[PDB]
Design a protein around this ligand. Sequence first.
Ligand code: BTN
Ligand code: BTN
Lengths: 119, 120
Amino acid sequence: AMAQELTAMSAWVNQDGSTLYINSINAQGELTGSYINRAAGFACQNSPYPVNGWVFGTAISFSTKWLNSVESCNSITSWSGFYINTGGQGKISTLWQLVVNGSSSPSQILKGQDVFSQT
Amino acid sequence: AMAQELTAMSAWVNQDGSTLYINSINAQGELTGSYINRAAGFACQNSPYPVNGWVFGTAISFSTKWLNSVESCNSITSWSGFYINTGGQGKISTLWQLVVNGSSSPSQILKGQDVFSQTS
Ligand SMILES: O=C(O)CCCC[C@@H]1SC[C@@H]2NC(=O)N[C@@H]21
Ligand SMILES: O=C(O)CCCC[C@@H]1SC[C@@H]2NC(=O)N[C@@H]21
């Protein structure tokens, strides 16, 4: 059998239970999808947010604007990462940055690390 | 002379001479544009690369995929940052991350700071 690959129509869950749904990848490599945050310490949980970004081989970037019809967090997250297949599972290993509307210093940009696994 | 703000059809130049062209921002804040890199120590200079991203008030993210018909650098840069009005002059202060096709460790993701200023 086969580990999940980095393709259109693929779903990925990180260590905190948040899910990335990659829905389309166009011929240029532009991606669209949605994201559901389930990580404690952050608001905008349990509802879908829009995603765009890029794929280039095993490299990927994706970014979510935290506004939908139910809750706004006045912020944007961007992830930079790469696909690997280890331990029988496809994964996307990422570093992310979160910027809040109204910031005045780069010290206010929050940073973290997420590893997303297939399924 | 009031500041250029985060609007469609705005151009911005960083401390290395690279230019961000924001071409469109739709009513949801989704952005498209193009980017010309002029930073010493990096390839893929002096040709336009495609950009997408998001605007949210003064917060902005944008990302460039380093492939066009002239040169490929097998990589993607993502910027996160915020707009500031310094008194008639607009700037975007950012932190960036660059990830390369075929990477196997987060230590291989490059990081830096860029500040862009409004330009004609
Ligand atoms: O609180 C906010 O400003 C919006 C929610 C942010 C959730 C962040 S995005 C990076 C990290 N990965 C997640 O799945 N959740 C957090
Ligand atoms: O070398 C590459 O992989 C492609 C070009 C990368 C240029 C980077 S993007 C971040 C920083 N800011 C710039 O204007 N140039 C560099």
